[model samples]
Target: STYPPTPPNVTRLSDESVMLRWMVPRNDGLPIVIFKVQYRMVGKRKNWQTTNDNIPYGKPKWNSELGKSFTASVTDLKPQHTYRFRILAVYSNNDNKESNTSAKFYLQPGAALDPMPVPELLEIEEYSETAVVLHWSLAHLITGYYAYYRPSSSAGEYFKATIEGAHARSFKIAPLETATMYEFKLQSFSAASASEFSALKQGRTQRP
Candidate 1:
């Protein structure tokens, strides 16, 4: 005996576009519901201002409606730009209930595009729980672009995900192996090569 599981299916229908669709959760006596779609531009950081006010450096936007699936078209993007995204499959308990965030998607620039941004790593830390933490500087002069990063490996092994948004200066890595060695690097939509790797950071997790 079990409840229905939600569908975690999503696809990028185009280079700069993504199609999000999901299945209804099985309900025994649940009321008829409507779904709400909300999204933000991922990495949003506040840039320091000359006037001493920290303005919103990060720009996040939500969708127009709540539906099973919505097509999001990211326009006015610079060439060679990459972007990261996530989906929210919200269920309305008749305007009183809600759901959780679905799986996320990370996309890179297609062959014909480019976003000339500078990529740099700020810091990497290993928590006591063995989760890895990553912090990076925001890519400069870019829009609709994402950060593509991973542990350095000669075999090109990577954990794929999007940088949160244009304004984010750092990211935290988690659920990582403890007592292990690691390194990191970046890729982007811009024409500039990755600046350089942060100094190698190695750490051991707390013993259980």
Candidate 2:
């Protein structure tokens, strides 16, 4: 039988994960040795960054025995992100025949919460003391928001917080290594997908 008269079934299990499964086209005298599956996020699809990074927006493939269905499980995904998926049909032949491709399916990431505005860092102040001050204008945080800080000298050493409205304008990161610079970023985390980060801001504190 022709692979699938219809496209593969693409279903999202949760905000951070997705699952796809499809029936292998039946075979007659010719036994289907295996079925191959391939999938990827559609639209704004970027080049593969790392080897099998398991990102929500990339292609996936696998091989299976005849009469066996193909399923690709996607995980570690972000909320409010969309993914596109597809598959291929494979049959082994001693004569070496090529496999046929199946129809493609596109899926959008769903957010139970309404879409929220992306956060942006509008200003900053550096001091030679205990911490660096970061300021941002985010409507989501007019009610409240989260602040994250990392050492500029080092890529690691990070901290985060859920602050109230009054404290949203500026964040004073405490107990930072003295006489060192720090990189800070702000995110609006009320509901929807975490907003993309703003341009990283750098600030320095002097030794006491």
Candidate 3:
């Protein structure tokens, strides 16, 4: 009468779905005959939703590892929401054991029809008292760019600049304070899709 190991990880697959995987620590000589998958919104008042009460043994795909690893995909979820999931196992004699629930995972759906790739930061083209230029590259097309910045000396949250409709790979950030250091990041986006933020870059303006 031993319990299975807890699900250690949950991977986000899309805005509306995630793949859950877990391991059976010790079967205790009683081979698991089925599995149950349950989930719920992380901070909701509703009861847990059961996706499956019986995933027959050896029917679901498993990772090539010991401890009897298994994987299942859960779908039809709300985008930009947090969800929690757990799994249980049943043996041939109807003996069942439950694993600890997995930590919450967030779903971030893209605005585009498909997932967008993250852009890569290349270099800073220029920096002066009043302006700084950022350079980056993306493999796909985009309609506009988003630039975010924060004064390095301040603990203020990042603020987005006026959206730019630049088709080129370089962008100019301006009206910066002289002798001030600022943190900046940029991303490319289209009408429906947006790339992840570029790596943060810092620029120190020239002294007046």
Candidate 4:
């Protein structure tokens, strides 16, 4: 029930094109039904432009590609230009939010990055009905890790955390459902690049 769509993973495709794939927030009661792709020339300091005002939502769109993610690209961009892009999530009820913009980019023919390194094993150090403390190997990723968890079904909304600071290799997801089964994962990313989530680790907390 918080945060906008995640920022897109932007990659160079050609002199005038770039590919973007991003994630939509989970079904949080107010399902996201539309997305707005916005971008602007980085140094222009001018108004932004939307690729489309109303890109209709579809399951086959992402369900067809990788996991719970969307794939799209931008083209006809100018050469020698720097740009940044963001995705605005519009919910079924019309409330909307914007993701953090991608890192400033310059159009160039660059290789698509192989997936960022997968995180080592995710360790749940401790757990109880209302709290969970997870520990993993120390990470060398510059921007750190992102933690996401859910009650383990399509009917459940997702909650996430940005893990950094003193706990680059740890997360303690809390205030959870007593005795409910949940799925959790850690994703490692650099400033603008992120990789697939680690293998899932599920748990059911202890109750009185």
Candidate 5:
């Protein structure tokens, strides 16, 4: 049994994101429901921030050399900050009582942060009489995304949709006017700032 699990091993995925892998602890018979990470800057004298990732809905991934382990991603980090992370595996056998807590591990090198990358709006993925599926490309962990589309030659302030996550690359806009042409564009949002607008593209819905 892998009791209490091991401290997280950190790898810098980027200046803004990190990959944290930790051993899977002994649940006895129960399994983890939520894997939370409490992290903070090494010398900030500040409270720890939680990752709040509610994933790992399946079996723990098996690492040949390390045995069974779990993983998490920490993003939106700042430059020149040394981080310490503690892993908490929540087994729902009751009030989130945790197993033996693991020692903290440090991310040695200070982060070399850079500005978030802007997304390039791509062609409409698919469309129907009432909806248009839109897609775009951006290679970063963004906080959110925005989409705007309206009639091609009109000024109706661009119908809007705000997509959440550091993870949405496509969107679907629906219940549109039949046989109408719409202009669309996108923007990516990071931990602090909003990216520039993508080039406007057009799509048309089918006639009823």
Candidate 6:
């Protein structure tokens, strides 16, 4: 029996579906009868799973020499979840013979939604000698937010100040140089995607 090749791509079709595409395996002098696809949610105690309709029959014309490709759709998955998948090929005219399973492939069902709106009114709400608290209005469809900052005196490189849950409306950055200006921005992200950074905002730390 010949081994099945791993899927080249697994694409998120929606919050609850994914598409798997793979090239027909090369024949090692044996004809492939069908292909089997299986998957499992990513977890420490989960087991591989497949349904009665999971078997994908191989087309004779698409034999190894043909090197053609095929696609399978897996649906009814949970939103914002990750799953691992594998494939195996069964041989024709070989009793109880099947190819080795393909290497495990990981997939995330939830795709990043359209870019979220930029955070509004980004400003420093309060400040101390070494720390400044910043605030902004929440954006639509954002599961979380990221705040970035850089010393105004430094080159244009900005570092992430912190990650916050979507419910959060403010961030506090500390250890700043007293009376120094710092540039700040915000970004929103979903389960599998992120949006562009918000407009730049500046704040000055309080004098010691």
Could you tell which candidate, 3 or 6, scores higher by TM-score?
Answer: 3
Return whichever of 2 and 5 wins on lDDT: 5
Candidate 5 or 6, higher TM-score? 6
RMSD of 3: 19.2
- TM-scores for all candidates: the values are 0.37, 0.42, 0.48, 0.48, 0.43, 0.44
Candidate 5 lDDT, 1-208, residue by residue in tens: 2245567755554456555556664345565566677678778886778875654424423433445555556778875567777676666563353333334434334334455557788787547887788887775557666677888979845544556575777877776778888999887654334466889998998777
Question: Model 6: per-residue lDDT, tens digit, 36-131?
Answer: 667777763667677445344533344336464554556677765567666656667643333334344444443445656577746785478888
Q: What would the per-residue lDDT of candidate 2 be over residues 34-126, giving only the tens digit for each residue?
A: 333344444556432222322121111212243433334446656544554444433334221223333333334664535445567875566
Worst 10 residues of 2 by lDDT: 54-63
Per-residue accuracy of model 3 over 51-107 as CA lDDT, tens digit each:
843565662233334545555667788988887788877876788777887877777
Model 5, TM vs. native: 0.43
Q: Candidate 2 or 6, higher TM-score? A: 6
Regions of candidate 5 where Cα sits further than 4 Å from its true position? 1-114, 139-141
Could you tell me which residue pairs clash in candidate 5? none
Write down the lDDT of every candidate, Cα atoms only. 0.38, 0.49, 0.66, 0.66, 0.64, 0.61
Candidate 5, 155: how far from true, in Å?
2.2
Please give the RMSD to the true structure for each candidate, in Å. 15.2, 16.5, 19.2, 10.5, 11.3, 19.4
Where's the lowest-lDDT run of ten residues in candidate 4? 59-68
RMSD over all Cα atoms, model 6: 19.4
Candidates, ranked, TM-score: 3, 4, 6, 5, 2, 1
**Which ranges in model 1 have alpha carbons more than 4 Å from their true place?**
1-115, 138-156, 188-208
Q: Residue 101 in model 4: shift from native, Å?
A: 8.3
Off by over 4 Å in 6: 1-113
lDDT computed for candidate 2: 0.49
- The list of candidate 4 runs beyond 4 A from truth reads 1-115, 155-157, 165-167
